[PDB]
Amino acid sequence: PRDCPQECDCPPNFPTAMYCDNRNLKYLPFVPSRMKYVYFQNNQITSIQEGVFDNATGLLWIALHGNQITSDKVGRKVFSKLRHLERLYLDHNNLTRMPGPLPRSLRELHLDHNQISRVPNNALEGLENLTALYLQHNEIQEVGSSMRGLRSLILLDLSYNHLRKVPDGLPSALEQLYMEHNNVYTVPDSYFRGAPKLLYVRLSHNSLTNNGLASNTFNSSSLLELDLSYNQLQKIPPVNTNLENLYLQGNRINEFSISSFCTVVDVVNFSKLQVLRLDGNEIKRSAMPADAPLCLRLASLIEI
Ligand SMILES: *[C@@H]1O[C@H](CO[C@@H]2O[C@@H](C)[C@@H](O)[C@@H](O)[C@@H]2O)[C@@H](O[C@@H]2O[C@H](CO)[C@@H](O[C@@H]3O[C@H](CO)[C@@H](O)[C@H](O)[C@@H]3O)[C@H](O)[C@H]2NC(C)=O)[C@H](O)[C@H]1NC(C)=O
Ligand SMILES: *[C@@H]1O[C@H](CO[C@@H]2O[C@@H](C)[C@@H](O)[C@@H](O)[C@@H]2O)[C@@H](O[C@@H]2O[C@H](CO)[C@@H](O[C@@H]3O[C@H](CO)[C@@H](O)[C@H](O)[C@@H]3O)[C@H](O)[C@H]2NC(C)=O)[C@H](O)[C@H]1NC(C)=O
Ligand SMILES: *[C@@H]1O[C@H](CO[C@@H]2O[C@@H](C)[C@@H](O)[C@@H](O)[C@@H]2O)[C@@H](O[C@@H]2O[C@H](CO)[C@@H](O[C@@H]3O[C@H](CO)[C@@H](O)[C@H](O)[C@@H]3O)[C@H](O)[C@H]2NC(C)=O)[C@H](O)[C@H]1NC(C)=O
Ligand SMILES: *[C@@H]1O[C@H](CO[C@@H]2O[C@@H](C)[C@@H](O)[C@@H](O)[C@@H]2O)[C@@H](O[C@@H]2O[C@H](CO)[C@@H](O[C@@H]3O[C@H](CO)[C@@H](O)[C@H](O)[C@@H]3O)[C@H](O)[C@H]2NC(C)=O)[C@H](O)[C@H]1NC(C)=O
Ligand SMILES: [Cl-]
Ligand code: NI
């Protein structure tokens, strides 16, 4: 049992892999039953025909990035019988909608550099082993509640999109969240309290104003780095003493309030901030009081 499409290469030393990448292919051949790894990247494929993977029920990897696939030419239920699929690469195509339904066994999903306009609420239903989701460089306007059920998700990249609203609910294991270069103008009260293990957040180049925030929005005990540069902030939003890096350059901040870092300062209460950028705002260095180091006791680099 070693049949192989003529346009592809199947190594004898590794009979469960099939290489069809970078060959000017125009369509997908039907995959042999034994295959676990298939590589179709960097061709001129335009469609994923119905039933293409139905013989290979043991597929783990599918690489389809770097083609010209459109959403109307993704076959019906084409991924449905692949109940062990772990990794799927669909970045750099011509997709306008989320493909699906997707197998509940997925661990990584790449969908960046397409033209996806929206993530419906049920688009990622049941993917409880998904650890990384790449969606940057699309035209997404909203994702709704699609992220709530992803119990294993560590990384979510939504940067360089058209987001008007932050995701309505975050999963509990999330550590990295990137949403820079979007159109966010509001963030709700206690938004990050639902993500106990969140470490890195980027929200630069959006349309944030203090009136669109709550007092405690960015006060979270888990955060290490927070990037909010080039918004339209007039005041330093309050933060937790655990925060280590804060970027606020290119805003409209017109006062230095020490109470944004520490509500009370004593021998054991103080900010652990190491890096702080406040340059490109409406304050001079003299706006920072002489006794500021009592609060910012660890600040090694402060730019104003
Ligand atoms: C996709 O899969 C089909 C069917 O797979 C068959 O059913 C599965 C449940 C497994 O048990 C497979 O092992 C099994 O093959 C493949 O078609 C099948 O091809 C084989 C040839 O290797 C056919 O067997 C032969 O059939 C002739 C005619 O009856 C006999 O004279 C021979 O003695 C021998 O038995 C088998 O009949 C055929 N099955 C069907 C339903 O047509 C198909 O090749 C495969 N495609 C790829 C690309 O892998
Ligand atoms: C899949 O998408 C590619 C790329 O689409 C490009 O990026 C998008 C974000 C939009 O901005 C699109 O407007 C943009 O094209 C498509 O490739 C594109 O094909 C068209 C023709 O089909 C190309 O236009 C030509 O451009 C040359 C100059 O190089 C002119 O001389 C021609 O007269 C003609 O106008 C376009 O340049 C090309 N873009 C890229 C980046 O290669 C692709 O067609 C599409 N595939 C499907 C199946 O929809
Ligand atoms: C979500 O993922 C879990 C667990 O995945 C596991 O953990 C990873 C870190 C890796 O180590 C993976 O290799 C590993 O599978 C899935 O649960 C697992 O399901 C498989 C069935 O496909 C179970 O296989 C069994 O394993 C036992 C040995 O304990 C054998 O005796 C059996 O014959 C059978 O092969 C596996 O045990 C099970 N693991 C756990 C920890 O539950 C889960 O299926 C997956 N979710 C979805 C929807 O696919
Ligand atoms: C950032 O957030 C911390 C902690 O926030 C606490 O936990 C959240 C989940 C919410 O439930 C908050 O409501 C809650 O306060 C803030 O630290 C907290 O500051 C308050 C002062 O407003 C402390 O409360 C006071 O404590 C004294 C002495 O115990 C009492 O006498 C007072 O009556 C009053 O209750 C609170 O103890 C303190 N918590 C911790 C864990 O340190 C922090 O102020 C905030 N930062 C900014 C800039 O707003
Ligand atoms: Cl980039
Ligand atoms: Ni880019």
Numbering used by the authors: 73 to 376
Extract from the study:
The small leucine-rich proteoglycans (SLRPs) constitute a family of secreted proteins with important roles in extracellular matrix assembly and cell signalling. The SLRPs belong to the large superfamily of leucine-rich repeat (LRR) proteins, which includes not only secreted proteins but also a large number of cell surface receptors, such as the Toll-like receptors involved in innate immunity, the platelet von Willebrand factor receptor, glycoprotein Ib, and proteins involved in neural development. Here, we report the crystal structure of fibromodulin and a different crystal form of chondroadherin, which reveal that these SLRPs do not self-associate in the same manner as decorin or biglycan. The results demonstrate that, unlike decorin, neither fibromodulin nor chondroadherin forms a stable dimer in solution.
Fibromodulin, a class II SLRP, is associated with dense collagen matrix in tendons and ligaments, as well as in fibrotic tissues, tumors and atherosclerotic plaques. We obtained crystals of a natively glycosylated human fibromodulin construct in which ten N-terminal tyrosines were mutated to serine to abolish sulphation (N-terminally truncated fibromodulin was not well expressed). The fibromodulin crystal structure at 2.21 Å resolution is complete except for the disordered N-terminal region. The asymmetric unit of the crystals contains two structurally very similar copies of fibromodulin (r.m.s. deviation of 0.2 Å for 306 Cα atoms). We observed electron density for the innermost four sugar moieties at all four sites, namely the two N-acetyl-glucosamines of the chitobiose core, the branching mannose, and a fucose α1,6-linked to the first N-acetylglucosamine. Fibromodulin adopts the curved solenoid structure characteristic of all LRR proteins. The N-terminal cap (LRRNT, 79-106) contains two conserved disulphide bonds (Cys76-Cys82, Cys80-Cys92) and seals the hydrophobic core of the LRR region. The LRRNT of fibromodulin is followed by eleven LRRs (II-XII) that contain the consensus sequence LxxLxLxxNxL. LRR XI contains a protruding loop that is characteristic of SLRP classes I, II or III and has been termed the “ear”. The ear spans from the first conserved C-terminal cysteine (Cys334, disulphide bonded to Cys367) to the β-strand of LRR XII.
